[PDB]
Design a binder for this molecule. Structure first.
Ligand SMILES: C[C@@H]1CC[C@@]2(OC1)O[C@H]1C[C@H]3[C@@H]4CC=C5C[C@@H](OCCC(CO[C@H]6O[C@H](CO)[C@@H](O[C@H]7O[C@H](CO)[C@@H](O)[C@H](O)[C@H]7O)[C@H](O)[C@H]6O)CO[C@H]6O[C@H](CO)[C@@H](O[C@H]7O[C@H](CO)[C@@H](O)[C@H](O)[C@H]7O)[C@H](O)[C@H]6O)CC[C@]5(C)[C@H]4CC[C@]3(C)[C@H]1[C@@H]2C
Ligand SMILES: C[C@@H]1CC[C@@]2(OC1)O[C@H]1C[C@H]3[C@@H]4CC=C5C[C@@H](OCCC(CO[C@H]6O[C@H](CO)[C@@H](O[C@H]7O[C@H](CO)[C@@H](O)[C@H](O)[C@H]7O)[C@H](O)[C@H]6O)CO[C@H]6O[C@H](CO)[C@@H](O[C@H]7O[C@H](CO)[C@@H](O)[C@H](O)[C@H]7O)[C@H](O)[C@H]6O)CC[C@]5(C)[C@H]4CC[C@]3(C)[C@H]1[C@@H]2C
Ligand SMILES: COC1=C(OC)C(=O)C(C/C=C(\C)CC/C=C(\C)CC/C=C(\C)CC/C=C(/C)CC/C=C(\C)CC/C=C(\C)CC/C=C(\C)CC/C=C(/C)CCC=C(C)C)=C(C)C1=O
Ligand SMILES: CCCCCCCCCCCCCCCCCC(=O)O[C@@H](COC(=O)CCCCCCCCCCCCCCC)COP(=O)(O)OC[C@H](O)CO
Ligand SMILES: CCCCCCCCCCCCCCCCCC(=O)O[C@@H](COC(=O)CCCCCCCCCCCCCCC)COP(=O)(O)OC[C@H](O)CO
Ligand SMILES: CCCCCCCCCCCCCCCCCCCC(=O)O[C@H](COC(=O)CCCCCCCCCCCCCC)COP(=O)(O)OCCN
Ligand SMILES: CCCCCCCCCCCCCCCCCC(=O)OC[C@H](COP(=O)(O)O)OC(=O)CCCCCCCCCCCCCCCCC
Ligand SMILES: CCCCCCCCCCCCCCCCCC(=O)OC[C@H](COP(=O)(O)O)OC(=O)CCCCCCCCCCCCCCCCC
Lengths: 98, 101, 94, 98, 174, 324, 58, 64, 239, 100, 43, 35
């Protein structure tokens, strides 16, 4: 009667405490991975920035050639009035998930 | 959760406590607050009794009406006391008690 | 990422083909019962309850006490509805 | 000579990188915070890249074998730290974080 | 192309919803429409909504419709009618809606014409947002229960109304 | 992607073999409880019995009664069989041994379970037989009823784990198997699995002797075989889900080097085998409920208890800040 | 010991499950050069795409 | 306008929105905030960007 | 934290009282001991009491309804206009309920759920008045509409009442879909659903040649839903 | 072209619902089904816009609209059931007694 | 005399009583114990 | 009125949103790298 009730209740209490301990350990594991990603972020971003700048220069030369002899053009004109930099829009709704 | 008690229309009376704690508001209940509370509860119990006679459940109907009246009257008294402490309602008693303690 | 869904589609195509092969090789040699509607309604309600539970369950670490009590209020409303159904005999099939 | 700075190499060296290239990393991140335009951040990126590649070459010179084993296991398990503890300990015993 | 395939399947299945003589068949085609919709949702990266459309629309709502329609045993004579005489009225109403409403986004959202040049190299990658990516599920759950909890609770009230109404209108206790 | 079909076949074909031998194992265990021998003539120890039965079924002429739902009648078993098959795409057998590492895998399994009802409903309606229709309606109602409790138990596990990824659910049990603190939840889950798979003591379609015709009574040859195969594959899947959620999947019993010697797939298989044995044992031990009694149990017992366990687990984990 | 007859079909089922795991694991390993990694996120995909360049262009 | 992004960060067009709102919060004539408003709407739909790129594609098709 | 909810004291009270009446009615309507008494009039009197207490709470707490307006801003907006509108709505509900008791006892309409549905629809209309976002507006409108659908069909054995309900549900659902479509078009065109944001985006331009056809048709569809609701011709024949 | 293609998909679903209303004068069950089709199309519109605009408001409202669709179908099918029970038929000529 | 009415309810509805106890513990812990644990942490 | 949207009642978001600007789900991704 009381034996299985006590067994179930004690197992619940101690096991939920153990679930908490395991969750803490899993969290620390994730923070380790996430810190690792944080320290190598700047070099990856710098590489990507150099790549994009070179590609953008090539595209600007391409546009200068193609739009040669089109009056009123301005090569690489920023369409935003504020002039703040935005990445080129791609015309694909959700490219990052595929 | 970020919170902000700031109201659109400012208080027109001195602000004794901008965001009074629940127990402070309850302890701030005056005699008039208790009169409002008791009146609302009594009317609700009376309505429960009278409307319960025809179905034959006047007792349980009294209990149900009394629960509704207790909750409504407590909410009304809390409204008044908190509004007084916050300066939204005339709060001469709160200001007098504040300038002394 | 949605990359992991592609094997599921190819798996579906293959399972369909296996089904057609197995099924096709042997070709070579007025009494409306309202209680079903009622059980459908109850399943719909608790289906939406599980639906709303999923994001809450994965978000408990961030929403903390406020999210817990808001979901508790949601459950309180739905459980009052459940008590109403229980009292009215919607859960009895005799 | 210079190890190819693949994801495995960088992830395996991430702790050393964070301890060694911290000022360059922080400076790059501040400049990125102020301006997302890649062109206006190339200098801090070069500082970051030089720090990281110098540390990579240094660590390769000091503990070549342990670094090779740790990088190989990290690539094999796609940078999962938990499946690589033994060689991580061997790598850190010969190339301390300091 | 893939969106052409899914849209064609949805178009045919929807026509079958609205034109099948047998209502049980209509419910089954409706289920095909929800499957195609779920496919589109997977293309958008919204896997939670893709799964929930299966769980709720097909798993609960369509089941309710199927139970009700199957026990009705509708005879075709009660709901039959020739639709050839509707072709003009559908033609004008459809065309006006077609001309206005399939092209409403065109002036505001002008499509990018795909050129004979690799624009993929101009995709800029920001790794900062990729350190800790959020699922659709946890992004939604960050908001439902705290910042927009009142709407959540009002939806609960709507479901309570559904339960009460279902009982009061149909219950005949044995 | 060119090798993906090979992986898919390496899942599907051994699964079909496993179902064929699960039928034989059920017969053998049932016989041994009943002090008799099961099939032991067709092959040594009866090990060729499943192949003979399958061959007999494919060599049986199909009937296809003169109904007005000719397409639906044959497609219903295809639907239930395909649904039974496709749930295995997300099941992990060991660390990294899984076809689709879905982040939303738990909800995907719930969706598949919710889809399972349509094969039974359509088989009942399309067969042009009032008995089959009534039986199909009752079976469908029972499955949807117990799906609610299954979903709520899923939510309890999800609260403990914080991710819908099945592999993450397994690895969250490294500290302790969830079946220890949530043992009543595991018992509830197993019973709900019995009811959801139309298994004893909940097997209404098997109650022909009780004047309750099953939904597949008009089926012959391979449509009937497809229904049977889907049911037994779903039994294997429910055993696998019990193993994943509460017995730590591929994890060893104790985190010791002696136990870590034997591969995780073997741990997972052994736990699945225990649960399949319990399926058979329960069928051997008890009589069956009436439809009304089991519906009352579904709505009056398992739903309230599942909801209470959701509330208790979430409240406890929030209170002491033990959330994932 | 007659009851061991019933353990053979169960053992076959267990072996079948072990096959459904290990066969798909080894085919993926042979094709991709390394075993499947559980939890492939946006970061890992970006790492692999950038690593293709950093390797092939070296 | 809300600021909640679909991947758990600040929405793409939220800074433009906030600049426009802050402008309109003190400029008694909305014509003084026209530029910021069209910047916000350009961030939502990329209409002028895509139009200009289509002009480039058009000229390429004309000179070929 | 608790004081933030002073802005919704009236609504909290009426919802809680409605729950109390639902439980009371279902517990005693099913009572063999009390011989299944009709409770429509008892619950009606208690609900009239609840409406009057809600009115007291709302009218006497006029400044408090605007407390924590920034915290509540993305959910609703309470001001003087909503104050008076809600007071009038509660007064109308109280009068309508008071007119129902002879109907309850002489017809013997014993269903107390009628009163509960009226109270829940009153909750919905209260939230309608304070709605300040398309989402909140739609949700409150739908709650109100579903309550009406159910009560229109309350004489469930009557040909007339069942016909009314069927016509109402079909035409109501159609109009609601049209309105929701309009809301979706407006969101897609502006990135906003909050009324303040919509005001800022749309002001100063109206139709300045380069008009958002998305914005123009979203407005049109929303207007069609509204006109259905106010029974304006040609969206009137349901009424 | 992605956004115009996603929008025209939902648009064909909405137009199909409208056509189902127009073509089903003797079949009010299909009329209810057509209304659900329109609601599904609107829900899809919110989800597509959420992605296109990088904003979560479309997603919250989509979930709530699913709740409304469920309640709507439940109550509507209850009303259908009681109408059928009163008349013994679902034919439109037996639900035309209120007029003028 | 409501002390055996609860006894009778528990005897006749063990499942409902157990559900109420389990859920009530789950509600009691955050409502009462959690603020206590938060208060002991402040000091 | 002239410039009604200037009136403080209408600038609720301009005063609320800064209070939640550090909330997970609406932060600039670089804020986590530097904090
Ligand atoms: C449980 C029950 C059972 C039933 C069930 O559930 C319920 O079971 C469930 C199971 C479900 C299926 C699950 C899975 C899928 C697959 C999906 O299909 C993926 C399609 C997407 C992914 O496709 C590619 O994605 C990447 C490329 O994007 C590829 O990456 C490369 O490229 C990277 C970049 O260089 C490199 O870095 C990488 O290294 C390199 O590998 C990647 O390999 C490849 O996968 C989207 O792709 C497209 O989208 C493009 C954009 O629109 C289109 O672009 C076009 O338009 C542009 C202008 O707009 C122009 O500029 C372009 O020139 C012009 O081409 C184009 O059409 C096309 O690309 C279609 C849906 C479906 C069938 C589901 C249906 C519904 C179910 C049956 C459910 C069902 C209900
Ligand atoms: C009735 C009939 C009877 C007959 C029959 O049918 C039925 O009966 C059936 C019965 C079947 C057998 C059943 C079972 C196995 C085991 C399997 O072999 C182990 C699987 C392989 C991988 O899986 C492991 O690994 C996972 C990851 O660690 C473990 O996960 C851990 O970690 C998780 C996360 O923390 C935790 O969550 C987990 O808990 C934790 O365990 C997982 O558990 C564990 O299984 C073994 O891997 C090794 O092989 C590698 C090769 O590359 C070597 O790598 C090394 O070399 C690299 C290159 O230099 C370096 O880069 C590397 O650093 C360096 O290590 C190295 O030797 C070693 O790794 C081989 C197949 C066989 C015999 C089956 C044969 C066919 C049958 C006889 C059928 C037969 C037909
Ligand atoms: C009494 O209860 C029982 C049943 O229900 C009545 C059974 O169906 C069955 C048997 C049902 C089966 C054996 C189905 C097994 C099917 C498979 C293993 C997959 C197909 C196997 C085959 C031999 C068919 C081969 C088909 C081909 C096209 C050949 C190419 C490959 C048993 C044993 C039973 O005890
Ligand atoms: C203002 C509302 C105050 C509370 C209202 C009480 C709600 C229930 C009372 C409804 C009236 C009632 O009970 O009617 C019964 C009896 O009516 C009453 O006697 C009134 C009951 C109480 C109402 C007045 C008592 C004092 C109320 C003061 C405010 C409290 C039934 O009438 P009968 O069938 O006996 O008629 C026979 C006779 O010939 C009539 O002429
Ligand atoms: C089947 C289970 C039924 C359970 C029924 C009982 C519980 C129902 C919910 C009752 C409301 C809460 C009662 C619990 C009292 C404890 C509340 C508490 O502990 O205060 C916390 C705050 O709790 C709350 O404020 C949440 C209240 C829940 C909302 C309940 C709705 C009340 C009325 C809403 C009005 C809107 C209109 C309703 C629409 C229908 C403190 O949190 P914090 O400020 O320190 O930080 C916030 C959080 O940790 C971080 O995100
Ligand atoms: C390592 C081994 C792992 C094994 C895993 C699986 C275990 C085996 C499971 C299968 C066992 C046999 C299955 C066949 C029996 C099916 C019939 C069940 C009938 C049933 O549910 O009855 C209900 C009670 O059981 C129930 O309610 C069942 C749920 C019990 C949950 C317990 C809830 C409270 C537990 C206490 C927790 C307290 C601690 C936490 C604070 C009450 O219905 P009735 O009509 O039959 O009434 C009559 C009572 N004589
Ligand atoms: C508000 C937050 C939660 C909202 C939802 C839950 C609300 C709680 C449930 C409310 C449902 C109604 C409960 C009715 C209980 C009636 C009990 C009963 O049978 O009474 C008969 C029982 C015995 O009398 P008899 O009917 O004559 O046998 O009790 C009475 O009648 C006592 C009468 C005196 C009470 C007067 C004082 C009332 C003040 C308020 C308390
Ligand atoms: C539909 C929604 C269903 C859920 C029910 C919502 C309302 C019931 C809330 C009950 C908990 C209130 C509470 O503990 O607050 C005091 C409590 C004070 O604790 P004490 O100092 O220990 O008394 O306040 C708090 O500090 C927590 C604030 C919780 C948020 C309250 C939201 C609802 C406000 C409406 C209350 C109406 C009057 C009732 C107040 C007296 C209750 C004892």
């Amino acid at each position: 009667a009381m034996a299985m009730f006590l067994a179930v209740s004690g197992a619940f209490a101690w096991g939920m405490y153990q679930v908490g301990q395991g969750n803490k350990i899993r969290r620390a594991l994730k923070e380790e991975k996430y810190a690792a990603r944080r320290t190598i972020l700047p070099i990856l971003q710098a590489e990507e920035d150099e790549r994009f700048v070179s590609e953008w220069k090539k595209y600007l030369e391409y546009e200068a050639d193609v739009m040669k002899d089109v009056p009123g053009w301005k090569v690489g004109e920023n369409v935003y009035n504020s002039g703040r930099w935005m990445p080129p829009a791609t015309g694909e709704l959700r490219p990052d998930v595929w | 959760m970020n919170t902000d008690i700031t109201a659109l229309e400012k208080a027109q009376y001195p602000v004794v406590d901008r965001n009074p704690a629940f127990t402070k508001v309850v302890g701030n209940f005056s005699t008039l607050d208790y009169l409002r509370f008791s009146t609302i509860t009594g009317i609700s119990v009376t309505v429960g009794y009278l409307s319960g006679i025809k179905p034959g459940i006047k007792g349980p109907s009294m209990v149900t009406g009394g629960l509704i009246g207790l909750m409504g009257g407590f909410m009304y008294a809390y409204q008044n006391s908190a509004g007084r402490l916050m300066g939204f309602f005339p709060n001469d008693g709160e200001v007098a008690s504040y300038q002394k303690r | 990422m949605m990359l992991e869904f592609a094997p599921i589609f190819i798996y579906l195509v293959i399972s369909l083909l296996v089904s057609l092969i197995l099924l096709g090789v042997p070709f070579l040699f007025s009494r409306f019962d309202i209680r079903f509607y009622l059980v459908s309604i109850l399943f719909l309600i608790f289906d939406l309850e599980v639906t709303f539970f999923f994001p809450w369950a994965v978000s408990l670490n961030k929403i903390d006490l406020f999210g817990f009590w808001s979901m508790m209020a949601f459950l309180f409303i739905l459980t009052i509805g459940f008590l109403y159904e229980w009292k009215r005999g919607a859960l009895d099939w005799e | 000579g210079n190890p190819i700075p693949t994801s495995a190499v960088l992830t395996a060296s991430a702790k050393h990188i964070g301890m060694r290239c911290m000022p360059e990393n922080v400076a790059f991140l501040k400049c990125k915070k102020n301006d997302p335009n890649p062109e206006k951040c190339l200098d801090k990126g070069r500082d970051v890249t030089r720090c990281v590649l110098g540390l990579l070459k240094d660590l390769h010179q000091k503990c070549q074998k342990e670094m090779d084993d740790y990088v190989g296991c990290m690539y094999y398990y796609t940078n999962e730290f938990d499946l690589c503890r033994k060689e991580q300990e061997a790598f850190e015993k010969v190339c301390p974080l300091k | 192309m893939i969106l052409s395939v899914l849209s064609s399947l949805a178009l045919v299945s929807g026509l079958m919803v609205v034109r099948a003589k047998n209502p049980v068949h209509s419910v089954l085609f409706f289920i095909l429409v929800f499957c195609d919709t779920s496919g589109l949702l997977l293309l958008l990266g919204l896997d939670f909504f893709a799964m929930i459309f299966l769980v709720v629309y097909i798993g609960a709502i369509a089941v309710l419709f199927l139970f009700v329609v199957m026990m009705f045993h509708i005879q075709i004579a009660e709901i039959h009618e020739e639709v050839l005489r509707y072709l003009p009225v559908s033609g004008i109403i459809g065309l006006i809606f077609w001309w206005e409403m399939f092209f409403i986004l065109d002036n505001e959202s002008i499509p990018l014409l795909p050129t004979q040049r690799n624009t993929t190299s101009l995709r800029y990658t920001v790794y900062a947002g990729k350190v800790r990516s959020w699922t659709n599920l946890e992004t939604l759950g960050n908001l439902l229960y705290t910042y927009y909890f009142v709407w959540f609770l009002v939806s609960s009230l709507i479901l309570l109304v559904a339960m009460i109404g279902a009982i009061v209108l149909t219950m005949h206790r044995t | 992607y060119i090798a993906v079909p090979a992986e898919i076949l390496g899942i599907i074909l051994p699964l079909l073999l496993g179902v064929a031998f699960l039928v034989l194992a059920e017969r053998k265990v049932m016989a041994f409880v009943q002090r008799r021998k099961g099939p032991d003539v067709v092959g040594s120890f009866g090990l060729l019995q499943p192949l003979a039965d399958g061959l007999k079924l494919i060599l049986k002429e199909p009937i296809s009664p003169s109904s007005a739902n000719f397409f639906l009648f044959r497609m219903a078993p295809v639907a239930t069989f395909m649904l039974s098959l496709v749930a295995w795409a997300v099941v992990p057998f060991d660390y990294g041994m899984v076809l689709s590492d879905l982040n939303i895998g738990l909800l995907y399994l719930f969706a598949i379970s919710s889809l399972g009802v349509y094969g039974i409903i359509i088989a009942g309606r399309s067969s042009n037989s009032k008995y089959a229709f009534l039986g199909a309606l009752r079976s469908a109602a029972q499955m949807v009823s117990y799906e609610v409790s299954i979903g709520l138990i899923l939510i309890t596990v999800l609260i403990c784990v914080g991710s819908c990824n099945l592999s993450e659910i397994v690895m969250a049990q490294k500290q302790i198997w969830f079946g220890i603190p949530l043992f009543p939840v595991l018992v509830m889950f197993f019973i709900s699995c019995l009811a959801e798979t139309n298994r004893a003591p909940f097997d209404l379609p098997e109650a022909e002797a009780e004047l309750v015709a099953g939904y597949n009574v008009e089926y012959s040859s391979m449509g009937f075989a497809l229904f049977f195969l889907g049911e037994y594959a779903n039994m294997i899947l429910m055993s696998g889900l019990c193993t994943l959620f509460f017995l730590g999947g591929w994890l060893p019993i104790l985190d010791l080097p002696i136990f870590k010697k034997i591969p995780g797939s073997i741990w997972f298989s052994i736990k699945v085998l225990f649960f399949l044995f319990l399926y058979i044992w329960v069928r051997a031990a008890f009589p069956r409920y009436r439809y009304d009694q089991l519906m009352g149990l579904g709505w009056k017992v398992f739903l309230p208890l599942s909801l209470a366990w959701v509330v208790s687990v979430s409240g406890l984990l929030v209170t002491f800040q033990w959330l994932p | 010991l007659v009851w061991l007859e019933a353990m053979l079909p169960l053992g076959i089922i267990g072996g079948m499950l072990c096959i459904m795991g290990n066969s798909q694991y080894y085919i993926h390993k042979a094709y991709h050069g390394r075993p499947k990694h559980i939890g492939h996120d946006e970061w890992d995909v970006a790492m692999e795409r950038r690593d293709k360049k950093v390797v092939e262009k070296a | 306008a809300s600021g909640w992004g679909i991947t758990g960060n600040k929405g793409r067009c939220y800074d433009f929105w906030m600049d426009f709102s802050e402008c309109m919060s003190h400029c008694r004539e909305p014509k003084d905030c026209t530029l910021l408003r069209e910047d916000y709407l350009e961030c939502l739909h990329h209409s002028k960007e895509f139009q200009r790129r289509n002009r480039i594609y058009k000229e390429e098709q004309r000179k070929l | 934290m608790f004081n933030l909810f002073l802005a919704v004291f009236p609504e909290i009270f009426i919802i809680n009282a409605t729950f109390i009446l639902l439980i009371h009615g279902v517990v005693f309507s099913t009572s063999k001991k009390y011989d299944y008494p009709p409770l429509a009039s008892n619950v009606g009197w208690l609900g009239l009491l609840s409406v009057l207490i809600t009115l007291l709470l709302l009218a006497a707490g006029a400044p408090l309804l605007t407390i924590a307006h920034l915290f509540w801003n993305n959910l609703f907006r309470r001001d003087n206009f909503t104050y008076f509108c809600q007071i009038f709505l509660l007064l109308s509900t109280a009068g309508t309920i008071s007119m129902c008791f002879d109907f309850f006892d002489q017809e013997r309409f014993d269903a107390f759920e009628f009163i509960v549905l009226i109270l829940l629809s009153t909750c919905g209309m209260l939230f309608m008045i304070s709605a300040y976002d398309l989402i909140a507006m739609y949700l409150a409108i739908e709650l109100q509409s579903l309550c009406f659908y159910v009560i229109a069909a309350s004489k469930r054995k009557s040909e007339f009442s069942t016909e009314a309900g069927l016509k109402y549900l079909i035409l109501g659902a159609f109009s609601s879909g049209i309105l929701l479509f309009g809301c979706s078009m407006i969101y897609g065109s502006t990135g906003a659903t909050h009324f303040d944001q919509l005001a800022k985006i749309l002001t100063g331009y109206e139709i300045t040649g380069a008009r958002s056809s998305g914005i123009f048709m979203g407005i049109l569809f929303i207007a069609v839903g509204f006109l259905f609701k106010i029974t304006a011709v040609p969206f009137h024949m349901w009424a | 072209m992605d956004l115009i293609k996603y929008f025209t998909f939902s648009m064909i679903i909405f137009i199909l619902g409208i056509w189902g209303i127009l073509l089903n004068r003797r079949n009010i069950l299909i009329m209810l089904m057509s209304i659900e089709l329109m609601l599904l199309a609107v829900n899809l519109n919110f989800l597509v816009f959420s992605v296109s605009l990088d904003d979560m408001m479309g997603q919250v409202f989509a979930l709530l609209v699913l709740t409304v669709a469920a309640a709507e179908s439940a109550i509507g099918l209850a009303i259908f059931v009681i109408t059928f029970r009163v008349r013994g038929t679902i034919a439109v000529e037996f639900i035309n007694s209120i007029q003028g | 005399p409501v002390m055996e009415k609860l006894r009778m309810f528990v005897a006749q509805e063990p499942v409902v009583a157990a559900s109420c106890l389990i859920g009530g513990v789950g509600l009691f812990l955050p409502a009462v114990v959690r603020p206590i644990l938060d208060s002991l942490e402040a000091s | 009125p002239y410039g009604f949207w200037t009136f403080e009642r209408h600038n609720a978001q301009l005063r609320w949103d800064p209070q939640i600007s550090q909330v997970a789900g609406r932060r600039d991704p670089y804020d986590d790298l530097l904090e």
